[PDB]
Structure 1
Amino acid sequence: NLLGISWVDSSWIPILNSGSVLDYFSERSNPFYDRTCNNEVVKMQRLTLEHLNQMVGIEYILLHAQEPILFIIRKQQRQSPAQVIPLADYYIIAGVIYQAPDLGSVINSRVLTAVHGIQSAFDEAMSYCRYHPSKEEPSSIFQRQRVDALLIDLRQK
């Protein structure tokens, strides 16, 4: 989402209260999970109180409320919070890169680009060229005449 951007939009939340960040984080959008997982903060774990919502699944909750701009809380879909291991490129140890870039999608895009290039090459080479089955020798006196010219010019210059 907004991992690679550094924009500051404060007009999204007009009332910078405490509950605004939690309300913006609780809203599932688009295909986010509901309040049925275990260990996010305090509220709705189970018939139990792990924390609230950070079990296996899309953990879109308010684990670290940042009312100023937006709820900056990592997913951390596990039993322990405060861990730099999110689905998106977002680390906590001074900022680092992860394996979030999909290799399969990039490989498929490269294969598609290669197929398109092969098709373009076929179209360019079949409609412009043949795809189907369809005296300056120095052996004369110039072999010596050139040397004579060179000598004459070197003499004259």
Structure 2
Amino acid sequence: RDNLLGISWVDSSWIPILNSGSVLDYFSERSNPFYDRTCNNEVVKMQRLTLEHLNQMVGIEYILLHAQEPILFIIRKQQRQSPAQVIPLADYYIIAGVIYQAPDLGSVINSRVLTAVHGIQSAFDEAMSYCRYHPSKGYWWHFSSIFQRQRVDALLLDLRQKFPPKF
């Protein structure tokens, strides 16, 4: 209950018996952090029959949004003020029988920037410790050609022409 974005809930038995019809039931298994008893799908299961009753009694109705037959099954949480009035609350996506909450485009980016820059800052502090300075010496860490080489290069090319490389 600390962070709903950082929780994943699963169950093996329901995994092989999973189909477009049963996705809501899997979310409904109860003891699932994402879904709640307050949702009306619960009040429907308690009562009897599931039909256009979500359009009659309007409120918290978890409904499947998009579905790929094998694994992908996205669920959306809506809050209805009246029939033909829908307000989307959140989205919980199930990949490989593993339920996650869809991250906000912005909470994800905030956490991401924080981790990267924290790494950069640790690296910087560590690099600061090793540099040592003196005005005479300059900087240090805490851890040419005699120009007679043109004739040597001429001799090298001469021996190249004389003794060819036979790689």
Q: How far off its partner does 1:153 sit? A: 2.9
Query: Given that residues 9 and 33 in structure 2 are in contact (C-alpha distance below 8 angstroms), is that contact kept between their aligned partners in structure 1?
Result: no
Q: Which structure shows the higher strand fraction?
A: 2
Query: Given that residues 91 and 97 in structure 1 are in contact (C-alpha distance below 8 angstroms), is that contact kept between their aligned partners in structure 2?
Result: yes
Query: Given that residues 67 and 74 in structure 2 are in contact (C-alpha distance below 8 angstroms), is that contact kept between their aligned partners in structure 1?
Result: yes
Evaluate the alpha carbon distance shift between residue 95 and residue 149 of structure 1 in structure 2; reply closer, same or farther with a 3 A threshold: same
Evaluate the alpha carbon distance shift between residue 73 and residue 89 of structure 1 in structure 2; reply closer, same or farther with a 3 A threshold: closer
Unpaired segments of 5 or more residues in structure 1? none
Q: Distance in 2 between matches of 1:150 and 1:66?
A: 73
In percent, how many aligned pairs have the same letter? 99
Q: Distance in 1 between matches of 2:23 and 2:124?
A: 56
Query: Given that residues 36 and 53 in structure 1 are in contact (C-alpha distance below 8 angstroms), is that contact kept between their aligned partners in structure 2?
Result: no
Q: Distance in 1 between matches of 2:117 and 2:97?
A: 38
Unpaired segments of 5 or more residues in structure 2? 138-143, 162-167
Mapping of residues 43-122 of structure 1, within 5 Å: 51-52=53-54, 58-60=60-62, 75-78=77-80, 100-122=102-124
Residues 94-153 of structure 1, C-alpha deviations (whole Å, 9 max, x = no match): 999999431121121122113312321222212222379799xxx998447626852783
Evaluate the alpha carbon distance shift between residue 95 and residue 83 of structure 1 in structure 2; reply closer, same or farther with a 3 A threshold: farther
Question: Tell me, what secondary structure is at the counterpart of 2:119?
Answer: helix
Q: Distance in 2 between matches of 1:28 and 1:120?
A: 43
Query: Given that residues 92 and 101 in structure 2 are in contact (C-alpha distance below 8 angstroms), is that contact kept between their aligned partners in structure 1?
Result: no
Q: Distance in 1 between matches of 2:109 and 2:96?
A: 30
Q: Distance in 1 between matches of 2:160 and 2:71?
A: 87
Query: Given that residues 43 and 52 in structure 1 are in contact (C-alpha distance below 8 angstroms), is that contact kept between their aligned partners in structure 2?
Result: no
Query: Given that residues 22 and 65 in structure 1 are in contact (C-alpha distance below 8 angstroms), is that contact kept between their aligned partners in structure 2?
Result: no
Aligned match of 1:37 in 16, 36, 39? 39
Query: Given that residues 84 and 93 in structure 1 are in contact (C-alpha distance below 8 angstroms), is that contact kept between their aligned partners in structure 2?
Result: no
Evaluate the alpha carbon distance shift between residue 43 and residue 71 of structure 1 in structure 2; reply closer, same or farther with a 3 A threshold: farther
Evaluate the alpha carbon distance shift between residue 56 and residue 155 of structure 1 in structure 2; reply closer, same or farther with a 3 A threshold: closer
Residues 64-111 of structure 1, C-alpha deviations (whole Å, 9 max, x = no match): 999999999764544799999976768999999999431121121122
Question: Tell me, what secondary structure is at the counterpart of 1:79?
Answer: strand
Query: Given that residues 90 and 96 in structure 1 are in contact (C-alpha distance below 8 angstroms), is that contact kept between their aligned partners in structure 2?
Result: no
Query: Given that residues 92 and 102 in structure 2 are in contact (C-alpha distance below 8 angstroms), is that contact kept between their aligned partners in structure 1?
Result: no
- Of the two structures, which has the highest relative contact order with CA contacts closer than 8 Å and spacing of 6 or more? 2
Question: Tell me, what secondary structure is at the counterpart of 1:76?
Answer: strand
Evaluate the alpha carbon distance shift between residue 33 and residue 65 of structure 1 in structure 2; reply closer, same or farther with a 3 A threshold: same
Give the paired residue count: 153
Question: Tell me, what secondary structure is at the counterpart of 2:134?
Answer: coil
